[PDB]
Each structure stands twice: as C-alpha cells, then as structure tokens.
Design a protein around this ligand. Structure first.
Ligand SMILES: O[C@@H]1[C@@H](O)[C@H](O)[C@]2(O)CC[C@H]1N2
Length: 443
C-alpha cells in the first residue's frame, strides 16, 4: 500500500472558459477566448466556449458530484471579464455573485477552494490595449487581483496568480495557436516578462489584503530526455529551462532568466529587463506543477530553437502525448533540488482518451485509471524522498472545451454528454474517489 501524509489535499481541477459556457451572461465582457474561438479556422470543428459544460447553470450539480466523490479540494478559475467587463474600472456584482455561490457551497460542504486568478480568458478590452504585451498589464492585473482578494479572501485562502504562463506567452503570442493568436517572438518574450511582473504585483497586493492566505503560481512541465549520449544533453537542458518552471522560477528565486533561455532569447527581452527583477522576486508560498507527458529531444540545427522532438514507440493518449509516469517524480525532485520551494502541489495531471459510454451505462476508462495510478505512485515516491508535496489535482473533474482541440479531447473523470448535458461518473472517477477515501493507493 502507498499512504500519503495526513491531511494531503486530493483535488480535481477545471478552468472557467473550458466549463462555464454563457460567456456573455449577466453583464460579462468578452474574453480573448470568446473572440479567438469565434474566428473561423482557430479551433477544431469551429467549437467555442459558448455552451461548454453549461457549468454556469449546472455549478451546484457539479459541486455535489465533487462532494459525493469525497474529493477534498477544488481548483477552479475566475473569468476576469465576468468580474471587470472592461478589464479595469467597473466591477460587475453578478460576476462576483456567481463565484460567491460556488465558494460558499464548497465551504459548506468541506471542500477547499483553490482559486486560479488567470487561466487564459483575458478581457478582450485589455487585448485591444496590447494585453500581455503591454507593461501596464502589471497594473491591470494587480487591480483585478485586489478586487478578488477583497471580495473572496475572507473565505478563499489558497490562490494561484497564473496558469501556465509559458503557454500564455509562447503558444498565444509566438505559435499563434491559442488566443490572442499572434506570431511575434519579440511580443512573446515581452509577454513572458510582463506575466512575471503582473504575478509579482498581485502577490504584493495579496500581502496587503489577505493577512491569512497562501499564494502561488502554476507551470506546465514536460519530462525531457536526450535522444542519445551526445549536445542532446544540452537540448534537454534548454527545454527544461525554457518550457518548464525555471523560466519563471529562476527570476522569482534567483533574480534572472535561466542561462540557456538568455542564450536563445536575450535579443527579444526588453533591453532593461533586469530593472524589474528585484520586484519579481516577491516571496511566494507554493509552486504548482502541471504534468502530462515526456518528450525525447534532440539538437537539430534547422529547428527554430535548435531542438526537435523525436517520436517514440510508447503508449500515448488521444492528445498524442507519450505516457511517462516517472516524469512526475523527476519534476518534483528537480524543483526541490533547484529552487527548494516551501510547498509544492501537482495542480494538474490527467489524460485524454476517447471515452465511450458502454451499453451498461458506464464509462470503462481503464486506460485513465492506469495513467492516474502510475502517476499518483511516482508522486508518492517523491514524498517518501522529502519533496514537500501537499496536494494533487486531477485534470479534470469534467470533459470540457480543450482549447484549440475543442470538445474532441475528453480529460474528465466525469463524462459529459454535450447533447443533454448529462454527467456520467467514469470508472476513473469512482477509482479516484476510493483513492481519496483511503488517502492513497492499495494494489
Ligand atoms: O491540456 C491542459 C488544459 O486542459 C488546461 O487548461 C491546462 O492548464 C492548459 C493546457 C493543459 N493544462
């Protein structure tokens, strides 16, 4: 058996635009994901977050599922444009009311809210003013964060500034695959920098406003392995420093970007970017690591960053993501070893498989059970070796809008039939519930 520490926080996670629907209900402003997904060609099948899981109406049912499963924490995000429809200035009480009801309900039921302040749905009004490219976003983000802290900080005690700021900057502004859909490397690195400045201003405001809570930040991470014994080792070093937590944690803890990020990208950063570093070093309470997959990596002279991925004959999810459970153990060990944060959480881990409802009314997702079990096991290991992991969040409670893939990728432990909005708890949800009840793995 593999038992976790007493009071370890087993959770599930979602994001506002991915589950809520009703993006313009009750005075909400447009988000960049609203305008991006309404632009032909940007999202698979023309899918949008207009309806999604209709969580905007079905929130109570969904929380009742969390409760019935005995899950002890819920990570969810707040839609900035529901709260401040123009990004700054006017506060929409109906946006506040929506999340107030969720928060109060979670607390009544003994579920710990973990709130992600920004999970990618930037107010469109602010994108018109350059969004993450504009230095002034540190101000706008601080003002938004302050509103949240003042309204909810009496009840919510666990906060996350940013979800996956690498993806926000690079996939949003370099690759152009996510909102706002830009392809400019100089804009992408200014977004990296402004994301850090905004994160730090929000933490600063948190300290003035919420005497008792904890605040952190969440990063995407891959387990990069070298294709050979060669510069392949260094291509891995670059991918780690660039794509993983060091891009952001080296500034936060050490006051500068990682060395190989600077070798690649110094020309793209603002000229006097070091001037902002002491403020960026604002103390954080925990690091959230998201983890899904491993990647074989090789030096490649012809690649845009001199690194290409090498396909491996390994089990993959419906995302095409190689299943490499030891990766979650590696990233946990590596974060302690490099930055030694006081607390760590796995804020997302999960898998997309092409789930079907069988004739028995059930979703027999043994592939997802196997995936989760293996990763929970590797996380257990890291704990046994002294990593201060305080919690683990399954992505996702529900099948949802998977960004540019639309509804075609199902990550839930709860199946959503989008034609009726019916929720069907998958085998993996029942399995996970038993994990949480037992506080760990047994066979
Ligand atoms: O695929 C996951 C997605 O569903 C979540 O919103 C995210 O936080 C961003 C990409 C990855 N993790």
């Amino acid at each position: 058996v593999k038992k976790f520490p007493e009071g370890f926080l087993w959770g599930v996670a979602t994001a506002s635009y991915q589950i809520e629907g009703s993006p313009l209900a009750d005075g909400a402003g447009m988000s960049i994901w609203h305008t991006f997904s309404h632009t032909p060609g940007n999202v698979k099948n023309g899918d949008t977050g207009d309806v999604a899981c209709d969580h905007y109406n079905r929130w109570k049912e969904d929380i009742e599922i969390i409760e019935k499963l005995g899950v002890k924490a819920y990570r969810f995000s707040i839609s900035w444009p529901r709260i401040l429809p123009e990004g700054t200035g006017r506060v929409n009480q109906k946006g506040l009311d929506f999340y107030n009801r969720i928060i109060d309900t979670l607390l009544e039921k003994g579920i710990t809210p973990f709130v992600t302040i920004y999970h990618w749905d930037l107010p469109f009004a602010l994108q018109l003013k350059g969004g993450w490219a504009n230095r002034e976003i540190a101000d706008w983000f601080a003002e938004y964060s302050r509103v949240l802290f003042e309204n909810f900080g009496d009840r919510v005690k666990n906060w996350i500034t940013l979800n996956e700021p690498w993806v926000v900057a690079i996939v949003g502004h370099l690759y152009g695959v996510h909102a706002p859909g830009m392809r400019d490397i100089y804009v992408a690195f200014r977004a990296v920098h402004n994301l850090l400045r905004a994160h730090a201003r929000a933490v600063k405001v948190f300290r003035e406003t919420v005497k008792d809570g904890k605040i952190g930040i969440v990063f995407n991470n891959g387990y990069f392995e070298p294709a050979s014994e060669k510069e392949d080792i260094r291509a891995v070093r670059f991918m780690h420093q660039f794509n993983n937590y060091p891009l952001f944690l080296n500034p936060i803890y050490r006051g500068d970007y990682p060395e190989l990020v600077l070798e690649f990208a110094r020309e793209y950063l603002p000229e006097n970017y070091k001037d902002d570093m002491s403020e960026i070093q604002e103390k954080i309470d925990f690091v959230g690591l998201n983890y899904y997959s491993g990647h074989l990596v090789k030096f490649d002279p012809d690649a845009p960053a001199k690194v290409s991925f090498v396909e491996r004959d390994l089990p993959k999810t419906a995302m095409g993501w190689e299943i490499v459970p030891e990766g979650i153990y590696w990233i946990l060990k590596k974060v302690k070893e490099e930055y030694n944060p006081p607390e760590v959480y796995i804020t997302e881990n999960g898998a997309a498989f092409d789930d079907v409802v069988s004739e028995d009314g059930r979703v027999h997702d043994q592939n997802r059970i196997d995936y989760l079990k293996a990763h929970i096991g590797q996380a257990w290991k890291a704990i046994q070796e002294g990593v201060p992991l305080k919690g683990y969040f399954v992505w996702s409670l529900l099948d949802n809008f998977e960004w540019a893939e639309g509804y075609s990728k199902r990550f839930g432990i709860v199946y959503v039939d989008y034609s009726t909005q019916k929720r069907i708890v998958k085998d993996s949800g029942y399995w996970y519930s038993n994990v949480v009840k037992n506080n760990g793995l047994e066979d």
